[PDB]
Amino acid sequence: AHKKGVGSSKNGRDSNPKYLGVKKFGGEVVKAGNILVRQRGTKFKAGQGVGMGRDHTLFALSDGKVVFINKGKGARFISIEAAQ
Amino acid sequence: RRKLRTRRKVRTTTAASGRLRLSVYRSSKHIYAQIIDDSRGQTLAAASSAALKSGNKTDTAAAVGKALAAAAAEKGIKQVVFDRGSYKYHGRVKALADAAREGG
Amino acid sequence: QLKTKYNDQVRPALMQQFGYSSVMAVPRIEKIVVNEGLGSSKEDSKAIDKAAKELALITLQKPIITKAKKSISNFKLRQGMPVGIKVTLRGERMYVFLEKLINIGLPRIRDFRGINPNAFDGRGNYNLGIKEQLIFPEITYDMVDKTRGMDITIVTTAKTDEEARALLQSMGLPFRK
Amino acid sequence: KRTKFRKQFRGRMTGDAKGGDYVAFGDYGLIAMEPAWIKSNQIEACRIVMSRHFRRGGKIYIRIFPDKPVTKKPAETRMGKGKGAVEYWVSVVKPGRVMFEVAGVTEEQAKEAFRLAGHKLPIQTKMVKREVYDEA
RNA sequence: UCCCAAAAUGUAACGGAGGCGCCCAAAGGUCACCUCAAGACGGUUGGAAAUCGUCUGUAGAGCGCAAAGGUAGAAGGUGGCUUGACUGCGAGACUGACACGUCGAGCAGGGAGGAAACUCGGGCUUAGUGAACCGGUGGUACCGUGUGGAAGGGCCAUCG
RNA sequence: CACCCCCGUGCCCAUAGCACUGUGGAACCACCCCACCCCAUGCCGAACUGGGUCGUGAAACACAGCAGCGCCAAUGAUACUCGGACCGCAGGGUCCCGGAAAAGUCGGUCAGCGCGGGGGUU
Ligand SMILES: [Mg+2]
Ligand SMILES: [Mg+2]
Ligand SMILES: [Mg+2]
Ligand SMILES: [Mg+2]
Ligand SMILES: [Mg+2]
């Protein structure tokens, strides 16, 4: 036993596995359920036939074609323009 | 404030529901109770109060709602979405609802 | 109980003093705010009811306790603890407490001469300062706990301090000469 | 010299001068022709050289500041971690960057104080004059 | 979690920084309502800040924590009513050598909020964890050594 | 979408915004008016909410002017760079070929486009 410290200060190991990003892109065919975006907050917000999971995951509600709408950052949307 | 209109107007999930929206202008005494189409930038039915108020101004309640409900069948409309602008759904606007909720 | 005495004497006089295009463009009194910024050095559960009950007899209104902004500064500062007592007066209840001031409040003050006239709230408003509690019509040392005071704010529809200054005095208000 | 508040450590990379005019503040300047890391002590060395030459007044503009922290080898090893916080502070200088500029002194007075300050620097320099009014 | 990381994903070092091993019965569900930090000028204990008032104010605040993303048409702040922090299931994807891990529309039984469209299978998200083996406990009545029971086991649940 | 204007509601969400300045009242909208209840304020009809005029168009709004500020923003040139090929012991640099900024300057803007209902051309 010493009077100094428990864990030694000034470290540099530590980091984490992690994934993320866009899964399906502008002009891709999607089946219903297909995840099209993995993200943190609401980088991209849901549109036509596009849902939003607990972890802001954007998925297809109904089959079709992925369409991206870029209004100017923040106002970003993914939609499904149903093929039929 | 102006945040209340945009609030209910945002919670009115347009195309997911399939239904048409029913707007109301009860801030003044010339209630505009309109049937507005989601997709097309169109207003279908509608019933005002300026064109003969029937003496009443706030009591014209059911009158504008009845006028609307009847005008809806004339077009076919049966499925609706009511949008209480900033109006706390209680008097003037609560009657217009039942007036249309019983007139079709 | 004062309404027409605001109109008939003050209202036409301001168009006969200045000259407004309409009866609506003439300055008006928006609201009267009464604030009791106690606590800090008076952190007691007993003192909470004290001024609040005393305020309920003068304004005829139940007062609200404006809690601290959760400011946990160096000195005696913490979470949302009771630090101020507020009551708003507008319309009917406003003129009941305003008349009570010019008649019993303002003259029946020990060491009285008049109130500060100098440029107050630059955008046509007034913020009165009271330095005692035993100078009110319904407040006496017989049925109390200790010795204190209060603060009062007068909100007006006046565009400038120039137009605000006239309205206050012509309603009946002391100015040190 | 050193900076007041920071992060502790840095890196390294280079390419032609980004933010260095010609005639701002002073009448005559001293421009870098080579890239380097200007040590706090080399600037101090140049300053004192110029200040001494221009005895009284004080019209020396040091347009460069040492902000980059550099590290060191305690004595041996490698069987340990990242090192030496407190070695020395540096200013990343790229060719074109005005390091110093003088005022209220003649062409001849300035020619010399810069000729002197040049001998204390780890790079080749050039003495300059006016005719640069880019954006103000 | 950020940086390294070379504008997809991924990527090492005894490289540079910093957190987690829980918490919340509301800090959950839903329906209502509210809108921040700061500064100037004016005022009771006061007076550097405080409680009040007007004027500026994408947000310079907040979000139980670390940081990043996100966010005021709220994810911030306040209240009513509540227990979906449900049981049986999973079209289809994300992610990993596996074993794990993530997201999820839709169907049934039953509910909660709301007039209603609707929303609800915990929390703005990304940490708050531990295979298997042996075993404690509530349920179940599958096996049970000739038969009928029983001991013991199996099976749901869950604790170490 | 004969034409003017107004009240609602869209697409578009700064070339749509702010400031300054001017016009509009009894059509529409705004304050206003009173409130014991329906309903509402951790206090106050401020806001919600109810009954209604008058009075005014002050405030708000709508519309119009304007280029002071915001916002938008070239051409040229450079930075940087895919591929080809080199220089320097090095930090670092060059040539050929396409690609191509950011900032700045010229300048451009006080939007454009729908649907419904109300009131005017005495
Ligand atoms: Mg620009
Ligand atoms: Mg090529
Ligand atoms: Mg190359
Ligand atoms: Mg070589
Ligand atoms: Mg080229």
From Swiss-Prot, chain A:
Transmembrane segments: none annotated. InterPro entries: Ribosomal_bL27 (IPR001684), Ribosomal_bL27_CS (IPR018261). GO terms for molecular function: rRNA binding; structural constituent of ribosome; tRNA binding. The keyword Ribosomal protein applies. It holds the Pfam family Ribosomal_L27. Keywords: Ribonucleoprotein, Ribosomal protein, RNA-binding, rRNA-binding, tRNA-binding. It comes from the Bacteria. GO terms for cellular component: cytosolic large ribosomal subunit. The keyword RNA-binding applies. One of its GO terms (biological process) is translation. Belongs to the bacterial ribosomal protein bL27 family. HAMAP family: Ribosomal_bL27. Part of the 50S ribosomal subunit. Contacts protein L18. Binds the 5S and 23S rRNAs and also the tRNA in the P site. NCBIfam families: L27. This is Large ribosomal subunit protein bL27. It comes from Deinococcus radiodurans (strain ATCC 13939 / DSM 20539 / JCM 16871 / CCUG 27074 / LMG 4051 / NBRC 15346 / NCIMB 9279 / VKM B-1422 / R1).
From Swiss-Prot, chain B:
This is one of the proteins that bind and probably mediate the attachment of the 5S RNA into the large ribosomal subunit, where it forms part of the central protuberance. Part of the 50S ribosomal subunit; part of the 5S rRNA/L5/L18/L25 subcomplex. Contacts the 23S rRNA. Contacts protein L27 and the 5S rRNA. GO terms for biological process: translation. It comes from Deinococcus radiodurans (strain ATCC 13939 / DSM 20539 / JCM 16871 / CCUG 27074 / LMG 4051 / NBRC 15346 / NCIMB 9279 / VKM B-1422 / R1). The keyword Protein biosynthesis does not apply. GO terms for molecular function: 5S rRNA binding; structural constituent of ribosome. Belongs to the universal ribosomal protein uL18 family. InterPro entries: Ribosomal_uL18_bac-type (IPR004389), Ribosomal_uL18_bac/euk (IPR005484). It holds the Pfam family Ribosomal_L18p. This is Large ribosomal subunit protein uL18. It comes from the Bacteria. One of its GO terms (cellular component) is cytosolic large ribosomal subunit. Keywords: Ribonucleoprotein, Ribosomal protein, RNA-binding, rRNA-binding.
From Swiss-Prot, chain C:
GO terms for biological process: translation. GO terms for molecular function: RNA binding; rRNA binding; structural constituent of ribosome; tRNA binding. GO terms for cellular component: cytosolic large ribosomal subunit. The keyword Ribosomal protein applies. Keywords: Ribonucleoprotein, Ribosomal protein, RNA-binding, rRNA-binding, tRNA-binding. SUPFAM superfamilies: RL5-like. PANTHER family: 60S RIBOSOMAL PROTEIN L11-RELATED. Forms a bridge to the 30S subunit in the 70S ribosome. Part of the 50S ribosomal subunit; part of the 5S rRNA/L5/L18/L25 (CTC) subcomplex. Is known to contact the 5S rRNA, 23S rRNA and the P site tRNA. HAMAP family: Ribosomal_uL5_B (MF_01333_B). This is Large ribosomal subunit protein uL5. The lineage of its organism: Bacteria, Thermotogati, Deinococcota, Deinococci, Deinococcales. The gene is rplE.
From Swiss-Prot, chain D:
It comes from the Bacteria. InterPro entries: Ribosomal_uL16, Ribosomal_uL16_bact-type, Ribosomal_uL16_CS, Ribosomal_uL16_dom, Ribosomal_uL16_sf. GO terms for biological process: translation. Pfam families: Ribosomal_L16. GO terms for cellular component: cytosolic large ribosomal subunit. Transmembrane segments: none annotated. Keywords: Ribonucleoprotein, Ribosomal protein, RNA-binding, rRNA-binding, tRNA-binding. One of its GO terms (molecular function) is structural constituent of ribosome. Binds the 5S and 23S rRNAs and is also seen to make contacts with the A and P site tRNAs. Interacts with A site tRNA mimics, and is probably one of the key factors, along with a helix of the 23S rRNA, in positioning tRNA stems in the peptidyl-transferase center. Part of the 50S ribosomal subunit. Contacts the CTC protein (RL25). Belongs to the universal ribosomal protein uL16 family. PANTHER family: 50S/60S RIBOSOMAL PROTEIN L16 (PTHR12220), LARGE RIBOSOMAL SUBUNIT PROTEIN UL16M (PTHR12220:SF13). This is Large ribosomal subunit protein uL16. It comes from Deinococcus radiodurans (strain ATCC 13939 / DSM 20539 / JCM 16871 / CCUG 27074 / LMG 4051 / NBRC 15346 / NCIMB 9279 / VKM B-1422 / R1). The gene is rplP.
